[model samples]
Target: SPAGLLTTPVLTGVGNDNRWNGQIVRLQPVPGGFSTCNRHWNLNGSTYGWSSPRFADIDHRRGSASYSGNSSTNVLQFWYANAGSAIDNPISQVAPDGFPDMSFVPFNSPNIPTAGWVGFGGIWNSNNGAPAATTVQAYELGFATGAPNNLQPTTNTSGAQTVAKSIYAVVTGTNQNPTGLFVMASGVISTPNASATYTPQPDRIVTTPGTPAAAPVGKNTPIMFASVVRRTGDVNAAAQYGTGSQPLPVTIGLSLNNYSSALMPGQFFVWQLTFASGFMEIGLSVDGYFYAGTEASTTLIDLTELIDVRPVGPRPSKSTLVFNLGGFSYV
Candidate 1:
């Protein structure tokens, strides 16, 4: 967010030094993407040719990967800052008059907090050559203190600190050249509770039953599942680089696998995000275009925490938990 280039050893951004990053991934040249993206940090993890208000300005800052759609080398470009404190000083940096700034994400919420870490990001694709391009940005609200003021809280304030916030894409809503869903699942997952019996078994992760004294001593911890569903059509928002809502038909995708499915945006799907206290320091507060490296992220939504739903008793026990999902939607 600073004016000139940052020369200090540790950049002072990302609000509170919690370290927030916004990573942008492109499956193709992506209509308006290549020319405008300001990758402050190079794709190989370096710096802008000449640091200062670092952003995604470099043209050559991109890597290669093989995706379901494109098995050949695919373009993987990214732009990120080093510190959470940077968000406190966030900026909208454009190199020249015609170029759009990649230094900051467009936050529509006017009540955004000045400090806090975040793991938010955006997905983009323009039907490769269709009339419209869909960009879906995902992020959580109400999970952290001093979050966006207008957005409603989905999680209760009490004991909410133990619940960390994160938003990443398993797979882009649609793949290169569009249609259906290109599902990709990534998160903490538990081991199969049932052995190869193969007869429909109850989805339970119970500890082996032993003496009556240990009657059901095992517990079902909360398992977290993170996902992103995208839809693009009806309107021509190839202009939605970081502007207002590029609303297509937003379909939230839920991957059920173990097995894979091409859940188009119109259908309804069910999913869960479970967290049971404390992993690594969390980064899920502030973001424009999302990006969080594994070094700072917590564990998979799997084995780390298994979910359980017990009735609330009169006493406020430590195990008792309330709920809310701090989600903010941007076009």
Candidate 2:
């Protein structure tokens, strides 16, 4: 054994006897519950000492630190806070934070640019110094059941979640449709493209040529939604912490063969765009939705996850949020 003095574990816990150290994921509790901050919440084993039965074992030794394994009083569910409409970017009023804005502007060609359109040129592109451009905001569920739009959950010190800003998406041809749009997993294809190599292809949507599909659900209310986006050569030179980097131009459009007009759905036409994601496998709904309360997972409620497919693959796509709502199956 190449034993070095620092490699020895004999004296590692000598300072704390044989008991678990103070830093080994021990749970702490607060008196009067919500009266104090709950920054130390985590999923752990509460059956260590059998003091009580709970999934969130802050510690069997500590009081008021166990979850009691019940959602009673406080179960997990979606709470809509100040999430504004498309006209209210960065506004937290109607929709919950992280809720996708279902509203969009139309473009006859990919070259045409406008406000809130994907990859607009006039204002800010990837090179813009705004840190918000390249970030994907992760939000915590608001537990404040009875609070109003501007109010926050009183249960925790972290307060309510909020989205100061968000990123926009584009549709070169369609006014913005979210129908029959399936995808492959990651950079590879799956069931639909599950666990298999899928040659890259553009994505498609069903819409009327002369008449575009209206935003099915209006300005996008807080609902059960999921989305995936695939991009190729979307690298930014600014993030390159090394030398010898080329400014690679990116492309996002329909790299498909068939051209416009839907024969089915009457006037609706099926058009393909250049992109794909991992949504081909049956029952693997992870592409867009996740566990939640009051989250309706059926397409019956004008809800959907618009997965974006890029012209080229091998680079892959990412889900905007895997926030689905259902019993168990088809998830």
Candidate 3:
């Protein structure tokens, strides 16, 4: 069922070594379940000799899924690459010797190629033949470059030569009121250099109400969501501003039905702001005011007078701002 499964964007990365080219990102269920999982990627590289013992087969097709183990603890492995001439060649596979086989395929195909990204998904059945439910806990997208060697098709080929700018989101399985999963817009930013500033926009709001497919109102009314932007390595890295700048200026806006009951003076709406390494909680009062504190070494740009709320009549209010490494300036 779609309710039990969540799909993520086909993430891509550039090798740090800058010679190995790119990688396709994929998610795999941990030995236990989907609540936890490992991230894998496929990059351009040489063949894996059969003697490595890491894999059962030597056929190093750039895009192939290899399986291991048996009925109880099965493992799947594959290389994720962009769908194009890069993965046109055929490859061999080594499947597990047991019942309830699991197979994986590229999310995008050669005929219907999705440039710049690739992904894979599969089904797992337990010994009792019951289907195991899968849920996405989080997703990460970024760019990696610099390859140490071209000799092996393993992840190590890229080694420590790569630098990646990544964006991630955490999914809480608790909100099912909308009858579907809500995803925030996500993407990568280039490494920040002192001479140039990089600002990437990935903003979207999602709401879940108590009733599926119903308007958000009344008790348990609406759950709103938002995200925080940060560069890799530096939680407050000034990708858009010069170093050592003071309090960053940021602006936030909210849209609610005017007909809905007015929020009480003390009532507050909360949203989670996610960063590459961590997240923070933000609160908004019914009086058109909001606040957030530092957490996990991440601090929110103060929102004191940075917020602009239009008249609370029957229309939508839109606010904008310009942000730098230190903060944002309202427009």
The candidate that wins on TM-score is 3
lDDT tens per residue, model 1, 1-331:
1111111111111111101111111101111111111222211222221212222221111111112224222222122111112222222221111111212221222122211112223232323332112322222211222222222221222211111111222323222322211111111111112122211011111111120110010111111112121222112224111111000101000001111121221111111223354221111101111111122223322212322222221211122122222222231
Model 2 error, position 227 (Å): 11
lDDT of each: 0.18, 0.16, 0.19
| Better lDDT candidate (1, 3) | 3
- Per-residue lDDT tens digits for candidate 2, residues 81-159, read 2222212222222322222211121222112211211211111222334322212211112123233223322222123
Instruction: List candidate 2 stretches off by more than 4 Å.
Output: 1-81, 85-138, 141-145, 148-263, 266-331
Overall local distance difference test of candidate 3: 0.19
Residues 16-56, model 3: lDDT tens digits? 10101112221111111011000100111111110111111
**Top model number, lDDT:** 3
214, model 3: CA deviation in Å? 24
**Model 2 alpha-carbon miss at residue 122, Å:** 28
* TM-score per candidate: 0.16, 0.16, 0.18
